[PDB]
Write a protein that binds this ligand. Structure first.
Ligand SMILES: [Ca+2]
Ligand SMILES: [Ca+2]
Length: 424
């Protein structure tokens, strides 16, 4: 009988026996013809029908390239449609996507490629130098999304494959599907990610209310779990438009927000500082943005004031995330369909269908409200473990299923989480 905390919302039914793709597209028929991915640079629009078909084609293509269930591909791509097709294609096969920052060094990319046992690297022509001769010696294929160099395949060999050549497969809930690194490979499963997505956007009163006429700006990098999950996956679930920006600069960012009337803005302190200093911000209609969320460190008081002055209809709020946790441990309840009050400085309320407690690090004993200790969470959304490192897993998830974040915070009288130390 510890002191356990739960969400202010009720639990919901979570269909986490479904594979990730079957869950994200479960309600595709309600929005088959709506915009799904919008490429900000060239304005190309893929509907939900196109996105699913493209992902299944990519899956058959990966199959023809020798990817079997539980094999791993690496995505070394900026935000782009191809990132999505690769990621979802690997999921259709029951295979694993490890994603990496394309601006990594050769030594960085290669170390992740070998720890993850990646059979294919999907990349841009301009980055092939970093891996081309590593790939060569270890029979790892290279596929480029813009143009193949001598010894690589062009991504059309996947996107043009026959969708009905996807092999019959028996995906299990605990099968790994996503392997971001944090450096340790964090094994996220179909069950985890479906749970995490449902805890965020499903239910009669969703913790984060998004619907199929929203436009979500996808400028935060998809190779970080924060956006992979809370923008792409959640957006797919509810049928929203995912307006992809491949790299941030302030002008096209304001341009895309006005022209596409972005309603959901996943920002980070470096973005709001660009907004603060850019003279041209006052020359754009940004009234479409109704929800702004932080994906990294908290904005602070000045940056929060910038968002309130430049985005007049934007609700502002802070969550709390960690890669091993799914990533989302807590969500801002001001974003709920039927909103709750919040408080400056708070990092949200623990997700529904989960338990949280605060563990004094000397004792090991759960703490009351308004006292600081290590944040711990438990639920189906958390990782399965670190890849090939059972010991580091055993020090991070205990025997009762509790994940120890290493962050110090407390929960106050209104079930609002406050974090006081993130430096481990
Ligand atoms: Ca065909
Ligand atoms: Ca199954």
């Amino acid at each position: 009988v510890d002191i356990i905390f739960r969400s202010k919302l009720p639990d919901i039914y979570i269909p986490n026996h479904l594979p990730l793709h079957s869950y994200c597209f479960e309600n595709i028929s309600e929005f088959s013809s709506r915009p799904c991915l919008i490429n900000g640079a060239n304005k190309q629009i893929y509907t939900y029908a196109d996105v699913e078909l493209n992902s299944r084609k990519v899956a058959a293509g990966l199959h023809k390239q020798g990817i079997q269930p539980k094999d791993t591909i690496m995505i070394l791509l900026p935000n782009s449609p191809e990132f999505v097709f690769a990621f979802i294609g690997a999921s259709y096969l029951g295979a694993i996507s490890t994603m990496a920052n394309p601006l990594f060094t050769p030594a960085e990319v290669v170390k992740q490629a070998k720890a993850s046992s990646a059979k294919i690297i999907v990349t841009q022509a301009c980055h092939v130098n970093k891996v081309k001769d590593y790939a060569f010696e270890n029979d790892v294929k290279i596929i480029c999304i813009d143009s193949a160099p001598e010894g690589c395949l062009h991504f059309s060999v996947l996107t043009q494959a026959n969708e009905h050549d996807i092999p019959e497969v028996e995906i299990q809930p605990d099968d790994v599907v996503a392997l971001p690194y944090s450096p340790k490979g964090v094994m996220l499963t179909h069950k985890g990610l479906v749970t995490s997505v449902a805890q965020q956007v499903d239910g009669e009163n969703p913790n984060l209310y998004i619907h199929s006429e929203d436009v979500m700006l996808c400028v935060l990098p998809l190779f970080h779990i924060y956006s992979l999950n809370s923008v792409l996956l959640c957006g797919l679930r509810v049928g929203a438009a995912i307006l992809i920006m491949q790299k941030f600069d302030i002008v096209s960012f304001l341009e895309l927000i006005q022209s596409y009337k972005v309603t959901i803005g996943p920002f980070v302190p470096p973005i709001v500082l660009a907004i603060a200093k850019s003279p041209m911000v006052d020359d754009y209609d940004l009234s479409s943005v109704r929800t702004v969320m932080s994906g990294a460190a908290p904005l602070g008081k000045e940056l929060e004031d910038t968002v309130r002055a430049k985005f007049p209809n934007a609700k502002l709020g802070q969550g709390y995330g960690m890669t091993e946790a799914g990533p989302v441990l807590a969500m801002c309840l001001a974003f709920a369909k039927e909103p709750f009050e919040i408080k400056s400085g708070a990092c949200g309320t623990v997700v529904r269908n989960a338990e949280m407690k605060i563990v004094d690090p000397k004792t090991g004993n759960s703490l009351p409200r308004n006292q600081s200790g290590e944040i711990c969470i438990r639920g189906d959304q958390i990782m399965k473990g670190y890849l090939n490192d059972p010991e580091a897993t055993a020090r991070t998830i205990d025997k009762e299923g509790w994940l120890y974040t290493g962050d110090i915070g407390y929960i106050d009288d209104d079930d609002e989480l406050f974090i006081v130390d993130r430096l481990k």
